[PDB]
Amino acid sequence: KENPMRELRIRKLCLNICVGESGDRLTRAAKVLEQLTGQTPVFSKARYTVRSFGIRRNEKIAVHCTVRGAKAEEILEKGLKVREYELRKNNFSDTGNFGFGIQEHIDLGIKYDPSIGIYGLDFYVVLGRPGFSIADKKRRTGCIGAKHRISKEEAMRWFQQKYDGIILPG
Amino acid sequence: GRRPARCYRYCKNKPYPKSRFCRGVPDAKIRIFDLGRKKAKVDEFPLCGHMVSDEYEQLSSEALEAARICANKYMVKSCGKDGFHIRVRLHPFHVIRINKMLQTGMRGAFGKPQGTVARVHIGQVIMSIRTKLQNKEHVVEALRRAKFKFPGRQKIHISKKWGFTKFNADEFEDMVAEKRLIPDGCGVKYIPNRGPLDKWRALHS
Amino acid sequence: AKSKNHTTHNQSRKWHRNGIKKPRSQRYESLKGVDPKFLRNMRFAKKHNKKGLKKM
Amino acid sequence: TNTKGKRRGTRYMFSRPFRKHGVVPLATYMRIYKKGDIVDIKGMGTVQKGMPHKCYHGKTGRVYNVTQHAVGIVVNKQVKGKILAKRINVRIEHIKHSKSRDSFLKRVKENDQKKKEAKEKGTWVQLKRQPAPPREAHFVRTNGKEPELLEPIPYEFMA
Amino acid sequence: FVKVVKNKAYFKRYQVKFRRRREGKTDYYARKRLVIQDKNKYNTPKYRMIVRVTNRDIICQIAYARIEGDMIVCAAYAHELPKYGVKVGLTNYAAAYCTGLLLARRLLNRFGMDKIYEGQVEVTGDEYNVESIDGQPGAFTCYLDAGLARTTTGNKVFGALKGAVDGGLSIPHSTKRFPGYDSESKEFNAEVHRKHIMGQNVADYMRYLMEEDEDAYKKQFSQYIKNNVTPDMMEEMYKKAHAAIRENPVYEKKPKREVKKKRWNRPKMSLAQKKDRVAQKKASFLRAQERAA
RNA sequence: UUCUCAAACUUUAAAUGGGUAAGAAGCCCGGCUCGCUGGUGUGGAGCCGGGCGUGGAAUGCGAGUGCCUAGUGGGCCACUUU
């Protein structure tokens, strides 16, 4: 038997739509994540001014959304479906997470709206394990130890075991 | 053009480098501090002759440069381009100041950086030549050619080391034989009985 | 008409003629600069040494 | 003339020792300072309030006043050609108990013991510190072997 | 390949934080202001009342910090509440109060301030003040050491505070952090705070899960069904805790047994053993290589 | 790994140097006072009354203290560091 406390699970599904825009194109991309997840997504202000991009210091560039537990498993089921249950070798982080993208949100389960428009958006599966909430406390914190960590090799075989995801190189 | 080396001979000041504070220093004449076949193995140039300073004085970047070539020019005709490796073991880091009177006087008489000079101690090596054990007199000749370019007194001393290393030549052959030394370019790697035992394993494989 | 700006040359000799004197090391020191909330209380303790004189 | 100013030439004096920066260890604050406690002064840089002036850093005085977070301490800064026993209000962290008086006090209660004892037993003791005397005569035994011959070693230049 | 931050050069310059700071147990910022006495008090012990709520326990200590390490005068544990009727539910706001009330009367037992400074015998929930009595030994004053607990309204650290406050400990506090503080218009309904101390916040959840599904109530409250605590028992159960705590507050220690004195713990592999392993490993390698080739 | 360095760099780190201590203003019990501080004849300080002189390192030397006060306030040289 393997230990049932090494149960590799999803912590959060980090979504964001970085439009490089404020006002009207951004505040209607906020409605996209709230139709998608069913929770009020946080707007992201700029780091500093890059004049080439069309951003500026403390300008709302993006709108991000963290989904936990029962909902995130079901939205990551919606989103992998858009990527016909397949991801690449490069797509998985060395820290043991993986993510992907989708070019338009119509393929998720939202119908085309003429007024609101189209928005491609980011999926990043933050894979965790019971005892990963040590490292972000106020009380006695600590690093999670080397054996307990999720590797790149481990996240790929998990996704292949869970979603039957055919992983292909390049 | 520039002043005689009498004026800036004795280590008079505190050591005054090209720094954040001293800006406006020209490039020194010496920029190669080793030529010959510098891209050489440890086990082909055993003999090492040093030009050791007998006097506490300042050797100019120009005197180091003039001696850099004087030893090089002889040893190329005497041993061939790849039959030696000269180092210049002095870098002109002390900046020398000039006060130019073109109606000032000694008012605000702080010098502008003129050039650079190498601050040398008694028993400090100026130039070292590693060549084959055959060419013992060619080093003693080439270093004596280059003594005249410097002020003060230099001593040509044949070191009891293995090329440009700090271990002795009568000990070297055994310290490589017992894998206490691996060659690594011009110099050698000292391997103590102290690291992790995986460091020991790739040695004795 | 420039002058000598500063020295401390003859000064050590001058200091040691009548001697570098330690201060008047006099027992029972002053109580100027001692915190007044403590010094008020001590002053009341001194006021009422009459009170317990016959016990004493 | 020098740039006059309170913290001038205190780059090292009021700097922290290597790998002894950060939090002030709390034994500093929880030791009691009585009146007439012989106390040596050492301006810790971490706490910038109630700092001693650089002329008192490495001096030793006695505490005359004790307030909440600081002691008033009488120290001998000289001046040019005399000595002024003077009073500085210094915080706890710039201050230790000096162990200079301790070798006296542990000698006094040892002197008091060596006087109260042999008050009846009649044996006269040495209580005054005799200096390091001229070492009295003794026999150096050579255990058979001759004293090993040393000779000066001949010259070689190293480098 | 990038420059490794953790070289030889790293750990030479590296200054470790204090041991309790490395273990994430003490805020040395917050400790320094709690613990230091005014220098014109001289050895007058500054008492701090240390409440630490754990996963399975509530540790309520009174300490005064000497220079060798702080000396604990009185320790009150939630695992001592089953001597007073509270079998399970050791870690809730009601148990916090009982542990604080147990600390208060146990200290006052030892100092002979048992009969004096009763306080709130009937739990009201109000802002009570332990006033000093003229002619009697002055009320014991200590200060609430919260640790690294985010002090929100209804933090159980304030349960054990109010527990101690009602037992006759003169601790400074405000009712802003007690549960029942109406934040929206800045009032404090003492009735809601009475619910939490007598445990009607837990009682209503037992009643909420009683009706919806029986399967989930057995999962949540598995030991309240075992140890036979119904929600109607709850309020009169903590009064049997409060009554017996105030009656018999003294702690009786567990007597030490004649133990085997065996070793559970692998001892430090000494030099001649460690100097031998490197001799054995090197021998083990070079013999395997000659046998191979 | 290696060559070479720092008045305005430094982990280290002297020599010479700068405070302090080497007792009766010091010891050690006992008791009184407080409006300060307090779980608490608690803490601290102030006070009376005591009781102990092998004067508690070497060396040399009598010290302490207060008035009035002139001249001076261009300096210069030398060893050493600069």
Added chain:
RNA sequence: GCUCAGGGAGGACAGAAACCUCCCGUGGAGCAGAAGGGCAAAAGCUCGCUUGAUCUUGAUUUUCAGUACGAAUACAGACCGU
């Protein structure tokens, strides 16, 4: 209540650089400015509440003649903030 500079691996547009993750991170950032010292559950960053930048005696430090101003340190008496 937080963690910074920077690096690393990921991810629609998206690139050397936009936002989002996770990890490393002794301060290599920031703290109005000169530079030094000081600082990591902070003295930095982000929010909340505010007027201790108020009123009032002395003592002390710093330059010092051991005078002023300036600045500063320890209190004490209030009235307040958190």
Added chain:
RNA sequence: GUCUACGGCCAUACCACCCUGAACGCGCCCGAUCUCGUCUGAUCUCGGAAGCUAAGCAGGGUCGGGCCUGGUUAGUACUUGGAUGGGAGACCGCCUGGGAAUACCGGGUGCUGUAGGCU
């Protein structure tokens, strides 16, 4: 023998990796009705006790890195005081006392206070 709470000194205590942990704690863990706080009950707060030492944590390991401590360097460098010493000088030697720092080479790898357990 060991842990917990709170500490004192703050690396002989850190760091990377590996192995072992009995009982008790400590934990991860399970919840979101209340208190409470968020984009999200992840954090924080609250309410619990099915499972598990996987991790934190503890002990131990590594010819580990670092740190600690010695020997070496070396009476070397430098230095107090001295000379009608030397040398054109630069600098050096002696007398008289003091006396370092790497590289290199061994050893060590937290002590412990108060309170409370477990064996």
